Amino acid sequence: AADSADAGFARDMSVHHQQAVEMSYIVRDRTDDEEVRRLAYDIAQTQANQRGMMIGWLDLWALPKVSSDPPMTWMGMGMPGMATDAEMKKLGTLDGKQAEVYYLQLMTEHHRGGVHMAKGCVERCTVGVEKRLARGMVESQESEIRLMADLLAERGAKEGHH
Amino acid sequence: AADSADAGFARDMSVHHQQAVEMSYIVRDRTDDEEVRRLAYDIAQTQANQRGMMIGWLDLWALPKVSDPPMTWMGMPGMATDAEMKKLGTLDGKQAEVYYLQLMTEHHRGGVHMAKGCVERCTVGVEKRLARGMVESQESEIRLMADLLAERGAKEGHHHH
């Protein structure tokens, strides 16, 4: 159904993934740093691919990619970790280490929100391949948060302060 | 259903798309030209997305992503060799732009041929639709790249294969 957890997670996580990909494109143009550029490439590759999977499911299921429902309605919460327009703009104005740090801070928050949403699908989704995808995102995003924490410290910084 | 044109197309076009995405990453590293970097972004975005769709279908259908030699199902076209990919990665600026446009033109021509096979043979509605759409979009992109080649004082590459 259009209002299922399976559909809502596919819609919402696709939009979430889209922003991670965009952040990755931006940071790669703002620094020469190999570690951060490689991480950004890996995140872009994985998240674009997973976005295609979820969009492909919605298509196969004949379900709209956009809902009238507020994001997260399927979790009873009608997104977590999404960067604001101002944050995306700021990222694009930074250079070198400052851009690396800001990207790592934004993506850490982004991953945290993502894990929350993926956990929601692990609980509520009914489609096996989608549940498993969500479970894999919890692991991969949590692993990447730990990595980015080290990259931040090595760059003389830490997770964003809210 | 592992032998189907639907499964075969999803497996083979997925591999084909992955290389186009890589080539787009390479050119974006090799030139500062806004127009060609835009084109590369568009292609990387479209093909990464379409590849995810097809891989997602295989996964939902519980079919392996690997098979048969590729293309057996339609009785790979346009794929760059490792050497050609390496060559692109050595080039700068205008030369990188031209070589990317020539390689991707060949790549798209091959992809169109494959997509036409799926238009003829695929039985899954959304997959047939996707293939039909690829024929049109990749053909349009070939036309757009011809203009970009012309602007840069070049033409489609000599046929090496």
Residues of B with CB under 8 A from a CB of A: 21, 25, 41, 45, 48-57, 59-60, 126
B146 Cβ contact partners less than 8 Å away, ≥ 6 residues apart: B105, B156
Alpha carbon distances (Å) from B115 to A4, A162, B32, B131, B135: 33, 49, 32, 5, 6
Contacts of B41 in chain A (CB under 8 A): 25
Polymer length in residues for chain B = 161
Whose tokens are 């703009």? That residue is: A89
Sign of CA dihedral A135, A45, A107, B40: negative
Question: Which of B37, B38, B42, B45 is the best substitution to test chain A (most A C-beta atoms within 10 A)?
Answer: B45
In our burial notation (b when 16+ CB lie closer than 10 A, e otherwise), range B54-64 reads bbbbbbbbebe
- Elucidation method: X-ray
Compute the distance between CA of residue A139 and CA of residue A104 in angstroms, rounded to an integer: 18
* CB-based contact B55 A53, cutoff 8 Å: yes
Q: Which of B29, B28, B27, B31 is nearest to B94 (CA)?
A: B31
- In DSSP notation, B45-68 reads HHHHHHHHHHHHHHHHTT--S---
Q: Where in chain A are the domains? A: 1-156
Q: Which of A83, A59, A63, A80 is nearest to A71 (CA)?
A: A80
* CB-based contact B56 A52, cutoff 8 Å: yes
Question: Are the C-beta atoms of B111 and B46 separated by less than 8 Å?
Answer: no
**Topology of A1-156 in CATH?**
Ferritin (1.20.1260)
**How many CB atoms sit inside 10 A of residue A60's CB?**
17
Which homologous superfamily is B1-153 in?
Ferritin, core subunit, four-helix bundle (1.20.1260.10)
Helices A34-60 and B125-151, interaxial angle, to 10°?
140
Question: Are the C-beta atoms of A74 and A63 separated by less than 8 Å?
Answer: no
Instruction: Note the resolution in Å, 1 decimal.
Output: 1.7
